[PDB]
Structures are given as C-alpha cells and as structure tokens.
C-alpha cells in the first residue's frame, strides 16, 4: 500500500474516520485513501469468496461501475486494527456543504441541476441494491470542471431491502419523522425525506429543522425565496406519512425538474469562474 500510493494531506476526519488525498504511484491518478479503525465498525459483510469484511466494502463494489455519479472504490486493505480504502478523487472538487457555505443559497437552476444528478444516484444505488442512508450536502462532492456531483460516504449504507430497517447512524437532522418516532423507516421513503431536506438546504442556504420536534411537525417555512414548485416539490417530499411521499418518478417528472442542464452546460454556466 505505502510502495503503491503516495500519501497527502488529511481532507478529513470524524465519525467516518480518516480521509487523505493520494496518488496512485503508477499513474499519477488521484485518489482519496480512507482509513476506518476496526473496532469502529459495526456492519460487516462478506466478499464473494467469503473474506470478513465491512459492509461498505461490499457496497461500494456493488455500486462502482461505469455510473460516475458514485464515487468508485478502486482498491483496498486490511492491516491489523483498520482497513484502507482507495477511492477516486476528483480535481478540482469541492463538497455540496462547503460551496452553498461559499456561495450561500444556489440559484434554482443550479440546484435543479445539481438535485437531478443526485437523484440519479441514488436511483443507481438503489438499482445496484444498495442504500445510502446519510445523504446531504457533506456527502456530495462537486467535479468543479465538469459539473458532475458524487455521492460518497457509503460507512452508515445498507443492502436495500422493502421490510422496515430498526438501526440508523446516518445524520439525524436528516433523518426522517417515522425514524424520530418510532425507530423505524422503510429504505426508499426515508431517503425521500433526506432528498427533501438536501433540497431545501441548497435553495434555502440551511437546512429546514434543527430539533426533534420540529421534524416530527414536520411544518416547513421557507426563510429564502423560494419559487412556488420548488416549495411545492420540498413539501411534497417532506410529507410526514412515508406513503404520501413522492416516488423517485414522481419527483422527476414533477414540473420543477423540468429542462435540467447537462453536467457540462452547468459548469460552464455556473462553475466556470
Ligand atoms: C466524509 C467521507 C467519508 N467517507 C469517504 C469520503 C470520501 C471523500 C472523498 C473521496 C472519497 N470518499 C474522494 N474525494 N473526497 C474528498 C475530496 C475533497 C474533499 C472531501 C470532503 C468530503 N466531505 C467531508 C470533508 C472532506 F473530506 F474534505 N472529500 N468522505
């Protein structure tokens, strides 16, 4: 590992462990090198040919095909207490969080943009079986030149399943109602709500509730201007009962997210600067 890559400056660290940039010694390709403590771990999988392993190895390599709407695992490592994940790294890049903290609320068109892509996704990690459980801002990464986001972050996933989860460790501030409540949530609904959040946080510059009590009312305000179907989208995803929630259809075909830009046009209307 140390012979393959050259090790960098530390991007971060918290709950999900150490993440550094890298380069991939042979190539010069950037990557990032995640470094998860084994007693950190909770959910553990199994490779095909049944090696111990953590479950966001497994879904990461469920998700990291041709689809670069998912940040792709390219290698990884067990050593004694931790295992090391090699990830792509884009460059430039730049997360959701740290560029509406920047940029403050984002205009509409570019937070119609930026929302179809991470619509796609998640639908791509849902096709691929596979469920997020913590999107937000923090865990989307911008491709500046581009203009393509990428999901990271698979440390609190889960296989998807259509029988109701009773364990969550993914960000409670996006965490939905049924889940406050009553410590339950169905996989597909619940990343609905998270969806609904993310979107009100990229128009609105913050995200809508802070305390338990204010997600279980579930009442939104909106503290920016904020046009009448995109108010009427968040709403509608924000919904308190899961089933009055929209489907990933539903949301797409909802008039707001009509004439989406490319990736392309989008960074060169509004990241090219
Ligand atoms: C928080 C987290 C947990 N697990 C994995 C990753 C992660 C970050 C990555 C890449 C792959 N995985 C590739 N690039 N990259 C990255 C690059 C620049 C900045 C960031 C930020 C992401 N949000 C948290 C802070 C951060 F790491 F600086 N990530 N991040």
Redesign the pocket.
Known sequence: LESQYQVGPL??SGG?GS?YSGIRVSDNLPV?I?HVEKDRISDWGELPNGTRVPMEVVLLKKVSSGFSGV?RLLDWFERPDSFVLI???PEP?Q?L?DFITERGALQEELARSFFWQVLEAVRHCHNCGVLHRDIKD??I?IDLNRGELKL??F?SGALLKDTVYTDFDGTRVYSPPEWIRYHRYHGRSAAVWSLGILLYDMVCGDIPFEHDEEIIRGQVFFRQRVSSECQHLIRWCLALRPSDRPTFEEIQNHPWMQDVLLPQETAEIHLHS
Do not use: C, S, T
């Open positions: 991007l971060g999900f993440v990032a995640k940040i990830l792509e790294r890049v997360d969080f923090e865990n990464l990271i972050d440390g």
